[PDB]
């Protein structure tokens, strides 16, 4: 969830990871991706 993923250092993103991360989880009711 949003809370678990940035408070990690991850962002929630609804399309493709930035370089260096991948999906990790979700965001937003489950339709974003938790890049971390």
Same mark, same amino acid.
């Given at each position: 969830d949003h809370?678990? /993923?940035v408070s990690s250092g991850?962002? /929630?993103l609804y399309?493709?990871?930035p370089?260096?991360?991948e999906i990790q989880?979700? /965001?937003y009711?489950?339709?974003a991706k938790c890049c971390k």
């Open positions: 809370y678990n /993923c991850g962002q /929630c399309s493709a990871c370089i260096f991360t989880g979700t /965001c009711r489950g339709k």
